[PDB]
Amino acid sequence: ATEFDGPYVITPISGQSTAYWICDNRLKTTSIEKLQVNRPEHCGDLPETKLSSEIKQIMPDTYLGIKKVVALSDVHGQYDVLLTLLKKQKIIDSDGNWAFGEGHMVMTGDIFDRGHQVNEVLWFMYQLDQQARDAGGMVHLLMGNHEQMVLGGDLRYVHQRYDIATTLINRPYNKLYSADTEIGQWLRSKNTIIKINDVLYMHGGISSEWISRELTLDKANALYRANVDASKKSLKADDLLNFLFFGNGPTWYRGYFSETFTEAELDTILQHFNVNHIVVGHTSQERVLGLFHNKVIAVDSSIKVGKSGELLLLENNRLIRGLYDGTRETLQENSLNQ
């Protein structure tokens, strides 16, 4: 079985973009006209996208007064599962397009790796970003540890199938998502940690080291954008970058899932950010669930396994689990845990 994969789009600072397509284990290269990334013939059902003049703008990391939010994470290249979940939960319409109005979606990282439909997910999320903006809503795609790994050249977890693209396009996988690329430029605009209303969102979690380093959302998000292309040596040698990018930092920390982590300790973090909840991915669960009297909501629902997933809905002072079958279960209402 040969592959179909792409497109990989190069976007220079002036002038037309170029798209690279893997079609039946051969490369096709097209010149993009009028921002429309159109697939050549004989190329499967690979995604077609209109390039955006707006969604690569860097957006705020803090938001007030947002009526409805949905959160999910760790798709890990499972496009079919993502699409089914969003369809069943009525986040998208019958054409596959944003249907969430002025709502906000927070996807807390880890589109890349393990799965076989990475570019399908990426281009879908790019289109959804634009569509949400056009509706007056937003998609917040946050950087996870696998975004950071891929962009930085840690390729341990890339599906073997992508060796076709790296051979045919003749560059390593990190350079298929470099700053010269449309997707790479889009990703390099993204935040890592955000606050919406009384909720903090990030991929892994916030450890007490954040507090001792006197970090802020803006300072961290800016350093993440500026240094995702730093060498490992440089990241490791800078004390602060080392914190941010590695095991105890926002995109790797798993302390909220440790059997010794205490709710008291969580309370000090909640207080530090003046939030009531922290929503995290990274550490895979069987379902969207709450921990510590629903002060932490885990939204890695194991989409990576390729069978099902779930989301979290925050609306009307409720926390709601949205199941893969389209049903809903309340986790918390007003402040009362269910």
**Residue numbers of the site for Zn ion (CB under 5 A)?**
74, 110, 144-145, 282
- CB closer to Zn ion out of 110 and 120: 110
- CB closer to Zn ion out of 5 and 74: 74
Query: What is the rounded distance in angstroms from the CA atom of residue 6 to the CA atom of residue 48?
Result: 10
Question: What count of other Cβ atoms lies within 10 Å of the Cβ of residue 271?
Answer: 10
Question: What count of other Cβ atoms lies within 10 Å of the Cβ of residue 34?
Answer: 8
| Min CB(203)–Zn ion separation in Å | 6
- CB closer to Zn ion out of 4 and 157: 157
Classify burial at 224, counting beta carbons within 10 Å of its beta carbon; exposed 0-12, middle 13-18, buried 19 or more: buried
- CB closer to Zn ion out of 43 and 280: 280
| Min CB(303)–Zn ion separation in Å | 9
74 is in an annotated binding site: yes
Query: What is the rounded distance in angstroms from the CA atom of residue 240 to the CA atom of residue 45?
Result: 44
Helix (H) or strand (E) holding 152: helix 145-152
116 is in an annotated binding site: no
Q: What is the Rg, in whole angstroms, of the alpha carbon atoms belonging to the chain?
A: 19
| Min CB(63)–Zn ion separation in Å | 23
- CB closer to Zn ion out of 63 and 157: 157
- CB closer to Zn ion out of 61 and 110: 110
Query: What is the rounded distance in angstroms from the CA atom of residue 33 to the CA atom of residue 52?
Result: 13
**Cβ-proximal residues to 165 (8 Å cutoff; 6+ apart), any chain:** 5, 6, 8, 20, 22, 173, 176
| Min CB(16)–Zn ion separation in Å | 35
C-alpha closest to that of 256 among 337, 322, 202? 202
AA letter at 171: R
| Min CB(60)–Zn ion separation in Å | 24
| Min CB(112)–Zn ion separation in Å | 9
- CB closer to Zn ion out of 5 and 110: 110
Q: Which residue reads 């914190």 in tokens? A: 243
282 is in an annotated binding site: yes
Q: Which residue reads 């969604």 in tokens? A: 55
Q: Which long-range CB contacts under 8 A does 307-312 form with residues at least 24 apart?
A: 307/81, 308/81, 308/85, 309/72, 309/75, 309/78, 309/81, 309/82, 309/85, 310/72, 310/85, 311/70, 311/71, 311/72, 311/85, 311/89, 311/91, 312/70, 312/71, 312/72, 312/279, 312/288
110 is in an annotated binding site: yes
| Min CB(235)–Zn ion separation in Å | 17
Binding residues: 74, 76, 110, 145, 203, 282
Annotated binding-site residue numbers for Zn(2+): 74, 76, 110, 145, 203, 282
In the annotated binding site for Ca(2+), the residues are 74, 76, 110, 145, 203, 282
